[PDB]
């Protein structure tokens, strides 16, 4: 709630929204999901992997 | 040199010369010279003797670790052709 909203005249670089109503904006909530991308069936040889 | 007769060049600068002085003497110098201040063994510098690197190589350390583990799926059996 301190970085996402910029007041008129303030630096908007790190913000998501800027405007006259900024001081009263807030996050209801945030959700994230992380997906991992990888390669499987790690090879083994006479040396091992 | 040219000499011309009858006006000949005097045969010398003769004896009428005016000895002007007897100041001819350089008095020998006699002296004792001592340059003896205590010397301390060291001088400070910013740097002496270094052969600074103009570029270094890339350098590294090393690690590995783990175990041998696996989840596998195989091709199905098939009819054998010949032999």
From Swiss-Prot, chain A:
It is found in: Virion. Homotrimer. Major capsid protein self-assembles to form an icosahedral capsid with a pseudo T=25 symmetry, about 66 nm in diameter, and consisting of 240 capsid proteins trimers. The capsid encapsulates an inner membrane and the genomic dsDNA genome. The major coat protein P3 and two assembly factors (P10 and P17) are needed during the assembly of the virus particle inside the host cell, when the capsid protein multimers are capable of enclosing the host-derived membrane, containing the virus-encoded membrane-associated proteins. This is Major capsid protein P3. It comes from Enterobacteria phage PRD1 (Bacteriophage PRD1). The lineage of its organism: Viruses, Varidnaviria, Bamfordvirae, Preplasmiviricota, Tectiliviricetes. The gene is III. The chain holds residues 199 to 247 of 395 of the full protein.
Curated annotation (Swiss-Prot), chain B:
It holds the Pfam family Tecti-min-caps. Keywords: Capsid protein, Virion. Dimer. Signal peptide: none annotated. GO terms for biological process: viral capsid assembly. Minor capsid protein essential for stable capsid assembly of complete particles. GO terms for cellular component: viral capsid. The gene is XXX. This is Minor capsid protein P30. It comes from the Viruses. It is found in: Virion.
């Amino acid at each position: 709630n301190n970085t996402a909203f910029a007041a008129v005249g303030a630096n908007p670089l790190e913000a998501i929204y800027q405007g006259a109503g900024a001081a009263d904006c807030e996050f209801e909530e945030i959700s994230y999901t992380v997906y991992q991308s990888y390669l499987d069936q790690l090879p083994v040889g006479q040396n091992g992997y | 040199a040219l000499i011309n007769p009858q006006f000949p060049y005097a045969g010398p600068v003769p004896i009428p010369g005016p000895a002007p002085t007897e100041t001819m003497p350089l008095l020998n110098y006699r002296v004792e010279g001592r340059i003896a201040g205590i010397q301390q063994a060291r001088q400070f510098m910013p740097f002496l003797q270094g052969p600074h690197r103009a570029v270094a190589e890339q350098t590294y350390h090393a690690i590995g670790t783990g175990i041998q583990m696996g989840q596998t799926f195989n091709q199905p059996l098939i009819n054998t052709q010949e032999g």
